[PDB]
Design a protein around this ligand. Structure first.
Ligand SMILES: CCCCCCCC/C=C\CCCCCCCC(=O)OC[C@@H](O)CO
Lengths: 30, 30
């Protein structure tokens, strides 16, 4: 039942969110 | 409220997961 969909997408929004945020903290660091 | 609880956990698990993944990936792969 679609209760896991909230988890997977939350992970997706969690993984994507961290990669980009760190990539914006490193983009200056060459 | 239970839906947002599942989504938030996905984010937290996603945030902690990605941080550890690349932190334990940068230092490893030299
Ligand atoms: C950077 C990667 C981050 C990975 C984080 C992974 C987080 C996983 C979080 C939660 C996993 C829960 C797994 C849930 C496992 C479902 C159990 C099951 O099979 O029962 C199904 C029933 O509905 C049948 O009636």
């Amino acid at each position: 039942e679609p209760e896991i969909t909230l988890i997977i997408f939350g992970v997706i929004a969690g993984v994507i969110g961290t990669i980009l945020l760190i990539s914006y903290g490193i983009r200056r660091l060459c």
